[PDB]
Amino acid sequence: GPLGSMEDFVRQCFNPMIVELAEKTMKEYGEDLKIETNKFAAICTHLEVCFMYSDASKHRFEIIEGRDRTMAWTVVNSICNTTGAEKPKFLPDLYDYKENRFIEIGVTRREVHIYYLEKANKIKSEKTHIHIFSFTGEEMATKADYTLDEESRARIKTRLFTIRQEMASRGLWDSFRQSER
Numbered sequence: 001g002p003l004g005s006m007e008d009f010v011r012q013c014f015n016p017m018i019v020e021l022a023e024k025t026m027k028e029y030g031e032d033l034k035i036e037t038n039k040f041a042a043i044c045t046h047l048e049v050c051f052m053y054s055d056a057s058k059h060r061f062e063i064i065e066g067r068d069r070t071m072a073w074t075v076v077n078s079i080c081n082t083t084g085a086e087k088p089k090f091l092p093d094l095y096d097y098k099e100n101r102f103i104e105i106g107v108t109r110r111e112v113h114i115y116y117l118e119k120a121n122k123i124k125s126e127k128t129h130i131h132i133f134s135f136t137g138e139e140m141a142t143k144a145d146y147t148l149d150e151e152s153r154a155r156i157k158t159r160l161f162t163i164r165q166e167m168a169s170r171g172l173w174d175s176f177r178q179s180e181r
């Protein structure tokens with residue numbers, strides 16, 4: 001069977017705003033999407049999941065991810081000043097105005113409990129909430145609190161399955177999956 005190009009896949013199957021933000025992110029961190037095309041796909045996937053999570057309840061969440069870094073920190077600092085939330089040590093992905101906390105979103109094909117533990121060990125807050133999605137449909141979240149309802153989460157998971165399925169039909173999945181870390 002033909003083995004497609006990952007860059008072609010990303011440009012065809014992700015919305016143009018997502019793709020532009022992903023390109024800008026990669027440039028900001030000094031990386032060529034032409035040699036790190038699996039990473040380009042992972043950044044787009046993660047960004048899309050952040051946007052879908054926010055869209056599940058419009059205006060409940062401020063989006064942090066996808067902004068250039070200096071701008072992201074000014075937003076985080078503003079939120080902390082306004083709401084009195086504790087300032088995080090690493091940029092998180094969202095702020096939840098309802099539960100009054102920052103959220104870190106993970107997207108993985110590794111074992112979700114291990115990935116969760118590595119995230120929690122990395123960020124070292126008892127405040128920031130972590131929500132992990134696997135392409136298997138599995139998920140794991142801080143204190144078994146999943147934040148959104150089952151159908152919002154099912155929409156995210158279905159999008160992940162769709163990405164996985166389209167990658168596989170293009171021969172792109174095996175390499176993408178192996179590229180993690």
Ligand SMILES: O=C(COc1ccc(F)cc1)c1ccc(O)c(O)c1O
Pocket residue numbers: 035036037038039040042107108109110135176177178179180181
């Ligand atoms: O981190 C990644 C890929 O991240 C993923 C994250 C979740 C997945 F299911 C698959 C891949 C990555 C891929 C290619 C590369 O060159 C690189 O430097 C990366 O960090």
Ligand SMILES: O=C(COc1ccc(F)cc1)c1ccc(O)c(O)c1O
Pocket residue numbers: 025026029031041042043044045046047105106107108
């Ligand atoms: O793309 C990301 C996060 O944003 C990034 C932004 C720039 C990079 F060089 C690397 C990652 C990503 C984050 C968590 C995750 O679980 C995942 O699969 C990701 O692709």
Ligand SMILES: O=C(COc1ccc(F)cc1)c1ccc(O)c(O)c1O
Pocket residue numbers: 065089090091092093105106107
């Ligand atoms: O952006 C990164 C890695 O690069 C960073 C750059 C600055 C930070 F304060 C934190 C991370 C990142 C990796 C995994 C992930 O899930 C995520 O949301 C990220 O932003």
Ligand SMILES: [Mn+2]
Pocket residue numbers: 065091092093
């Ligand atoms: Mn992030």
Ligand SMILES: [Mn+2]
Pocket residue numbers: 046093104105106
């Ligand atoms: Mn994240």
